[PDB]
Amino acid sequence: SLDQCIVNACKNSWDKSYLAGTPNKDNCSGFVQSVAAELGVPMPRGNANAMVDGLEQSWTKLASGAEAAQKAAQGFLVIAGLKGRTYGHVAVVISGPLYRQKYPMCWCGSIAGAVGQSQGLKSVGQVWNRTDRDRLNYYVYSLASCS
């Protein structure tokens, strides 16, 4: 599996602040801006919702969380995202075994605290809730980030 440079970018971005005075661990959007910047990947800017609108319009869209975990393993940056009536959420999907045989592991910051957060050990199906977990979108960038 080739996701290590993504994971590493994730680890490094975790302590950064894409916004002045706001550690990425508390800013889901900011957190992926830094992950993307450390990997030379252009990423639509804005809050979570605006980022999802941008992914929708310009990135490849995958079918399952399964397919998302494969693209991570292949060395590709994958974003799991889902708008909200008010605020959305985005996360970086990484390779490894699907939780409940369906939801891939991820990294994501969150203004909600630990229960909105993940350092590689919580699947998307443990960040998003029972209802939202099955409604996620998965976007993969068009060129690999990891050799």
UniProtKB/Swiss-Prot annotation:
Enzyme Commission numbers on file: 3.4.19.11
Compartments where found: Host membrane; Secreted
Catalytic activity: Hydrolysis of gamma-D-glutamyl bonds to the L-terminus (position 7) of meso-diaminopimelic acid (meso-A2pm) in 7-(L-Ala-gamma-D-Glu)-meso-A2pm and 7-(L-Ala-gamma-D-Glu)-7-(D-Ala)-meso-A2pm. It is required that the D-terminal amino and carboxy groups of meso-A2pm are unsubstituted
Record note on what altering C108A does: No loss of catalytic activity
Record keywords, A-Z: Disulfide bond, Host membrane, Hydrolase, Membrane, Secreted
Active site: C28, H89
Record has Signal as a keyword: no
Its job: Toxin secreted by the H1 type VI (H1-T6SS) secretion system into the periplasm of recipient cells. Degrades peptidoglycan via amidase activity thereby helping itself to compete with other bacteria. To protect itself, the bacterium synthesizes immunity protein Tsi1 that specifically interacts with and inactivates cognate toxin.
Protein name: Peptidoglycan amidase Tse1
Native organism taxonomy: Bacteria, Pseudomonadati, Pseudomonadota, Gammaproteobacteria, Pseudomonadales
Encoding gene per record: tse1
